[PDB]
Amino acid sequence: NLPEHWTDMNHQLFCMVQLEPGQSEYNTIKDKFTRTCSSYAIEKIERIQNAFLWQSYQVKKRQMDIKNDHKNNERLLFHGTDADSVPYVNQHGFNRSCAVSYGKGTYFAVDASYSAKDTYSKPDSNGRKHMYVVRVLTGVFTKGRAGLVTPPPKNPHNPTDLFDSVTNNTRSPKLFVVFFDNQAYPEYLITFTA
Amino acid sequence: NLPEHWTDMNHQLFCMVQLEPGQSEYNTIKDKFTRTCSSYAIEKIERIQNAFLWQSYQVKKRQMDIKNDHKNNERLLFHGTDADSVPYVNQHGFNRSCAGKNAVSYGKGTYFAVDASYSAKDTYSKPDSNGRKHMYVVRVLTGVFTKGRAGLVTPPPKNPHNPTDLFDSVTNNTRSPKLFVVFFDNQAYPEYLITFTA
Ligand SMILES: O=c1[nH][nH]c(=O)c2cc(OCCc3ccccc3F)ccc12
Structure with a gap:
């Protein structure tokens, strides 16, 4: 049941679809980035159309919607990576084993400026940096601490909730950490330069 | 959307269903077990009915069935663990971030065994304070596999030059596979828990 803003894929399950400048979908994502990264230069923005990743994600969202008994568990966040990991993220999403002050999960930033550090969006041979715009099921969150491998229990008298x-x-959160696969969907890749 | 032989859970999402000797369901797991673990004795075997883990697992199995070419992608394997992990694995399944280092390591992941005798070892199914040892029987999406190596954090690529396949x-x-290692959540479904003793 693929989102309707996706474009046809000729019966295939993975496409990276480059957005054209000045149409409304591109303007929205660019606005989100330029809010804190107006000083960088956008080369391109690509919509990530990964059917599998999306499917596992929406399953996890439907379950977190039921578990938390309400429907507001999703945030749009950012995640800068190095060029060598972009192919992997496109196809397989985020993976904590590849990645830690608030835990050993995947880190998502509220502000593009944070993901834009060269420590995160390391620039490649030709100078290019890479940052995803990510649907993240943050749901109910709490302060983290170093060494967590899963979020804390809500009530440590029911230790598995x-x-x-x-x-x-x-x-006033400025980063989020999620510790399970398919809690985050990588929705756009922004290719940019300093 | 759950298997039609599970017990009605009444819109609960999780329960454990103790099995009866004589029933084919119980007797086949015991045979499987005692095929290599004849000198331990089974206390009880519980069918794990966890709707969410099932749902996400079946989704990954569907995806691997589509991606691989008529491959038998699923195996029934064993997993020894300690009492303190049973509650977590029951509700949340297997989590590579929690897994032990195997005496012979073929990657950093969750390990599953062909033979119950392997899982039966004290270092996996640690006897709890009452002498009870615990072993999962697990549906594991083994897919297409290759020999592992200790440094692996994900399975290897089939071709170095296409690192994401x-x-x-x-x-x-x-x-002669005797163990398997999996590197992703929801790739293994804990279907029965064997409680056993010497
Ligand atoms: O955008 C990101 N991409 N990849 C990251 O690993 C990442 C990590 C990241 O850390 C935030 C947590 C943190 C804060 C202070 C000291 C140490 C810390 F770990 C933020 C953003 C990102």
Whole structure:
């Protein structure tokens, strides 16, 4: 049941579809980035159309919607990576084993400026940096700490009912960590330069 | 969307169903077990009915069935563990971030065994305070596999030059696999828990 803003894929399950500048979908994502990265130069933005990844994600969302009894568990966040990992993320999404102050999961930033550090979006031979815009099932979150391998239990008297993610600051989060596969869908890849 | 032989759970999402000796369901797991673990005795075998783990697992199996070419992608394997992990694995399944280092390591992942005798070892199914040992019987999406190597954090690529086209799992020996290692959540479904003792 693939989102309707996706474009046809000739019966295939994976495409990276480059967005054309000045149409409304591109403008939205660029606005989100330029809010804190207006000083960088956007080379391209690509919509990630991965049927499998999407399917596992929507399963996890339907379950987190049921478990939390409401429907507001998703945030749009950013994630900068190195060029060598982009093929992997396109196809297989985010993976904590590849990645840790608030836990050993995957880190997603609220501000593009954070993902834009060269430590995260390392620039390649030709100078290019890479950053995803990510649907993340953050659901109910709590402050993290170093060494977590899964979020803390909501009530440590029912030790297996867990928060859905952790953050550096609960009242005003600026990063999120999720510890399970298919809790995050990589939705756009922004290719940009300093 | 759940198997039509599970017990009605009444819109619960999880329960454990103790099995009866004599029934084919119980007797086949015991045979499987005692085929290599004849000198341990089974206390009980519980069918794990966990709707969410099932749902995400069946989705991964569907995906591997589509991607591989009429491959028998699923195996029934064993997993010894300690009492303290049973609650977690029951509700949440297997989590590579939690897994032990295997005496012979073929990657950093969750390990499953062909032979119950392997899982039966004290280092996996640690006896709890009452002498009870615990072993899962697991549906594991082994897919297309290759010999692993200790440094692996994901299965290897089938071709170095296409790094994202991955083996689904890895094994200690391709010609006579006795263990498998899986590197992703929801690739193994914990279907029965064997409680056993010496
Ligand atoms: O955008 C990102 N891509 N990849 C990352 O690994 C990443 C990691 C990341 O850390 C935030 C957590 C943190 C804060 C302070 C000291 C140490 C820490 F770990 C933020 C953003 C990103």
